[PDB]
Amino acid sequence: MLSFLLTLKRMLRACLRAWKDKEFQVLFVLTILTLISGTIFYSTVEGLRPIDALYFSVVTLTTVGDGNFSPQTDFGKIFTILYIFIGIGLVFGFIHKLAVNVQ
């Protein structure tokens, strides 16, 4: 259906118009930076391969969770605690953003 494509394209255009908003770019860079930091930390402190440090960082920051790995060191546990709250602060940031864009 042509209607379907046109509607999708419009939506895709509206989505791309967000990656041009400064506040969104910030939130975006911040989560990327957060993901990098997590990758480094877990790779360093918990001794995970970079790929598994990124996976755990992603899965943790998004609340998906990992069914097998749990931080083994106390420093890792403390970091994960703060990491999770950064993630929540980030999502509220995006939520609030989407909220204001409805005004």
- 58 Cβ partners below 8 Å, 6+ apart? 35, 38, 64
55 binds a copy of itself (CB under 8 A): yes
User: Are the beta carbons of 41 and 26 closer than 8 angstroms?
Assistant: no
Which of 31, 69, 32 lies closest to 48, judged by CA?
69
Rounded Cα distance between 72 and 47, Å, is: 10
Using the minimum distance from each CB to Na ion, give the nearer residue, 7 or 70: 70
Between 65 and 89, whose beta carbon lies closer to Ca ion? 65
**Of 2, 4, 13, 19, the one binding a copy of itself by CB under 8 A:** 4
Q: Is 70 in the site for Na ion (CB under 5 A)?
A: no
Query: Which segment (21-29, 36-44, 64-72, 79-87) binds Na ion by CB under 5 A?
Result: 64-72
How many residues sit in the footprint of Ca ion (CB under 5 A)? 1
